[PDB]
Structure formats: structure tokens, C-alpha cells
A paper describes a structure:
Kaposi's sarcoma‐associated herpesvirus ([name]), a member of the human γ‐herpesviruses family, exhibits extensive cellular tropism and is associated with Kaposi's sarcoma and various B‐cell malignancies. Similar to other herpesviruses, [name] depends on the envelope [name] (gB) for host receptor recognition and membrane fusion initiation, making gB a prime target for antiviral antibody or vaccine development. As the fusion protein, gB mediates viral membrane fusion with the host membrane, triggered by signal from the gH/gL heterodimer—a mechanism consistent across herpesviruses. In this study, the high‐resolution cryo‐electron microscopy (cryo‐EM) structure of [name] is presented, revealing a unique trimeric conformation resembling the postfusion state observed in other herpesviruses.
To identify neutralizing epitopes on [name], we screened a previously established phage display library to screen for human monoclonal antibodies against [name]. This screening yielded mAb [name], which was assessed for its binding affinity to [name], and its potential to neutralize [name] infection. mAb [name] is the first human antibody against [name], providing a valuable tool for studying [name] neutralizing mechanism, despite its lack of neutralizing activity. Using single particle cryo‐EM analysis, we determined the structure of [name] in complex with mAb [name] at the resolution of 3.6 Å. Local refinement improved the resolution of the gB‐[name] interface to 2.92 Å. This complex structure measures ≈190 Å in height, with a top view width of 125 Å and a bottom view width of 95 Å. [name] Fab binds to the DIV loop region of [name], with a total buried surface area (BSA) of 792.3 Å2 engaging both antibody's heavy chain (579.3 Å2) and light chain (213 Å2). PISA interface analysis identified five DIV residues interacting with seven residues of [name] Fab. Specifically, four hydrogen bonds (S564‐D99, S563‐N32, S564‐I102, and L566‐R50) form at the gB‐H chain interface, while four hydrogen bonds (T568‐Y93, T568‐N97, N565‐Y99, and N568‐N97) form at the gB‐L chain interface. Structural analysis revealed that mAb [name] bound to [name] DIV, the same region targeted by other five herpesvirus gB antibodies (VZV 93K, EBV 3A5, VZV SG2, HSV‐1 BMPC‐23, and HSV‐1 HSV010‐13). Structural homology alignment revealed that EBV 3A5 and VZV SG2 share partially overlapping epitopes with [name] [name]. Hence, the lack of a resolved prefusion [name] structure and additional [name]‐targeting antibodies for comparative analysis prevent us from identifying the precise reason behind [name]'s lack of neutralizing activity.
Author numbering:
A (entry chain G): 1 to 109
B (entry chain E), C (entry chain H): 1 to 116
D (entry chain C): 58 to 102
E (entry chain C): 510 to 560
F (entry chain B): 510 to 611
The structure:
Amino acid sequence: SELSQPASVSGSPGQSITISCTGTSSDVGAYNFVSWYQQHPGKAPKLMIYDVTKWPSGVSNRFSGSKSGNTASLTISGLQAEDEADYYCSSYASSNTYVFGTGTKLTVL
Amino acid sequence: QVQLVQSGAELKTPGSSVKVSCKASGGTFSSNTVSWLRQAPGQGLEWMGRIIPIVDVTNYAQKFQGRVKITADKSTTTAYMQLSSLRSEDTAVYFCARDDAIDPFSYWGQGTLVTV
Amino acid sequence: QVQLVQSGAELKTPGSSVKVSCKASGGTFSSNTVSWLRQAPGQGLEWMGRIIPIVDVTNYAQKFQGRVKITADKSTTTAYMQLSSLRSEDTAVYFCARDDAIDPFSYWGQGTLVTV
Amino acid sequence: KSVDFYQFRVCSASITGELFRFNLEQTCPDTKDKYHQEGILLVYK
Amino acid sequence: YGRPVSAKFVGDAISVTECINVDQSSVNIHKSLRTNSKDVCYARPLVTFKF
Amino acid sequence: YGRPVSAKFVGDAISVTECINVDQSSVNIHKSLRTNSKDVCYARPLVTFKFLNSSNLFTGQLGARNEIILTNNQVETCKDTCEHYFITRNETLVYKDYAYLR
């Protein structure tokens, strides 16, 4: 029951990009411990969004998250820079098991 | 600033046993939980298993039960993961992440590359 | 002079559930036992089961086990019999009887006709 | 009827029986002390 | 308790009910402990009584 | 012993270890006892908590005298008109049938 994520999303400078993450209601619809991880090519994954919408320490505030129903949406407003790290959505599931999304690739011009 | 050390890449024949050792810095394991995650080239991420040394409890995925053995040492603060019967697609990199009061996996290791 | 009141005739589709309520007069059920019997047109008298409310024990026949549910209410002194997965042969007249100091089938009931 | 175990009976009904719990908090308090007031005493005959 | 009672476990508590006697005059005990077939003999004798 | 301890049988002797508490701030108890399928409902409600300040979710079966068991092997057949009573510290939980809360 792996989470489903979009294959890729377009983008442009001075724009906001929204990435969706949906799955079974047993994992995402029963708890509120969703997380988003950014992984650079040939680099360790980095966490930027945890819990529900609370930002972690020492990170940019241009990113936000909102979970409605069975679907979570991560919205980024800070364009330019690199913005090339692949985004993965994760959530807690029953029987002390963790799941991760397929992965989302962000491309910019 | 807890650092993780992972063993170098090793080559093994298909169907053999592969052992990966991960060393955690700092004082001791304490209440932290050590998780293992594999990533294939060009594929996504999945949760293999985790170990909590406070109760010495190992949690495994439903598709990896009875195939992966996880052990921890309270003296050397080292975690050992054994996966025998390695299959071809099994070839992948391996990360030993660590839980943190902020959020789990808050730390990542260098990674171990396994080729079948 | 204990008098028993049975519900009116009801028509239900095959494969449904039929509930029959029998009301017993007097003070209370006490140690008396309530038995449920059926009679097909032109056939003999069958034996569905019995219920004792002073211990709340239901005795069922070896052929009707798992198909008829019997419940009792001491506050209203009412016995409810529910039948499920009935066939086309369930069209019959049902009676609720009442155990007495002499013979068990001392009392009876107007009877309820069930058609499939 | 529960006069005694001598009479044969069958009792397996359980509908609205009274509920009870085991208490594991009672303990013997320690003994108190004694002031034992005292002083100088003189007698006179 | 001095009087016989019946008790069972309900959750984390103990539920106790009352007891009811049966007809002492009409009691029958079978004199044969051999049940039908073989190797399935009853451990204790069966008793038939009214209420 | 006044303090709670964990004990087991090793050979002909009894081996007793120490005990460690969990994060009391993050505790969740499910209000529904209905599991998947039928007639395999859990005997006791499940409890979700964490260990110390570590950010991780752990689900187990609540025991007695505020004890958490990670082996959810306690199952029972579904019974109509059931009733359950549980005691946790200075509070009581009443479960009518196999759901609800009181």
C-alpha cells in the first residue's frame, strides 16, 4: 500500500508549485504525522516539512503543507535557487509500519 | 550533531548473505530507534525495518519478515543488518537513519552500496 | 390461568428474516420454560427449541442450530424468535408454549401463520 | 437460592451481576511517637 | 463468601451474580460412565433434574 | 517488590530485569474495539505512545496496572451485548458492546 505521488511537476520563476500526496485512509486518514523529504542527486535526504504544518528549526518559511480529507498538499512559493531535489511523501501506518511515496520530480526553467 | 558511519561497498554472489554494519556516534543509543532504508537506482524509497535497543524490539515490514535480521550492540553502539538469499534486484544503496526528538530519520549515514 | 398472546400473520420474501414475538401474562417468567413449535399444513408438530430465562439458557434442535435466535425479556415477559435464511418450506403456523408444574406443553398460543 | 453447597443447583446466568474490583493501595501506617515529657521532681513528706 | 455464588471476569473487574436452586426431589444420576463410541468416555457422570 | 519489575523463568532460576517508563504526554487510546473481518475483535483496546523524547510512534496492547504490551496476541470472538470495564490509574473506562466510551 505504497503512497502515490505525481511523476513530475512543472515550474517557473516567481511561481508557486503544489505537490499532492494521497493514499489509504488507514495511514494518512487516521493519523497526522505526514512528512516531506527532499533528496538531492547523490546526496542524503533532507526533511523540510513534518507533523502537519509546523515548520522545523532553521529552514525557509516559503514552504507550507495542508492535509484535507485523505490528501495532503505541499505548496512552495520560493522559486529560483536550485529547487531540483526530489520530494517524497511519508506517513505513519498501522502495525508499527512506515510507508513512503513513489516520488515527485520538480523541474524549473 | 550525531554522525553515522556506514561500511564500504561489497560484492557478493546472488543468493548469499550480506552483512552491513552501521556505527552511531555520540554518547549512547539511549531511546533512539535505528531504521534501515534501501534505495534502488532510479526508484523510490521504502521502509525495511527498525530496532529499538531500550526494549531490544525489532519491527519488520510485512514483505521482509523472516528474511532480514537486525541486531544491535549496547557497548560498541553498532547495528548489524543481515540479508541472505540476496536476489539480483536486491542490489541497492543502504542508509541507517536515526530517530530524533524533532522527527525520526533526522540523521542519515554515508550509505552502503550492494551489487548483486 | 396463564394466557399467551402471539403476533399476527406476516408475509416476507424468501431469504429474509422473520421475527415473532410471544407475550406471556401473569407475574413473571420465573422458572417456567418457553418452547417454540411449528406445524406445516397437513403435517405434524416439529420442535424448534426452548428458552429458560431464570438461567437464560437456550436449547436448540440439532437441525435448527445456528439458524434460529431466541431472546427473552423479563421486564416485559416477552419472547422473541428470529429466523434467517428461510426457504420455501417455512410456510407454517408457529406456536409458543409454556412449561407447567404438570406437563411441559401445558399452555399454548393462538399461533402465527408465516407464508413464504 | 444459595443457602449452602449441600443442595444441588445450577447457576451460570450472568446478565446484571454486581461489579467489584481489587484494591492494592491499603497499607499499614507506621506507628506514632511519644512526647515523654519530663523534668526535675522533688518530694516532700 | 459463606453462601455459594457465581463470578466471572468483565474487562478488568469481577461480575458476581446470584444462585438458584433446582428440584431436589427429581434428581437422577446415570450408573454408567461409558459414553457412545470409544475413547470419548465422559469424565464426570451426567445428572438429570428439573427446575 | 514495591517498584514494578519484569521477571521470567530462565532454566530453574528466575531472571528479573529493570523497567523503563514511556512518554506520558503522548498517549492515545482507541475508542473502537472492532478489528478487521468478524469474530476476531481485540480483547483489549490498543494504545499508541512514544519512548522518552524520541519522535516515533509505537502501538501496543494495554495491560494491567498501566502496562504496555507490544505483542497483540489477545483476541476473542465477538459476543453480542458485551460489556467491558478497564482501570487506568485513577480513571475508569466503560465499553458498551464493542465500541463507544464512558
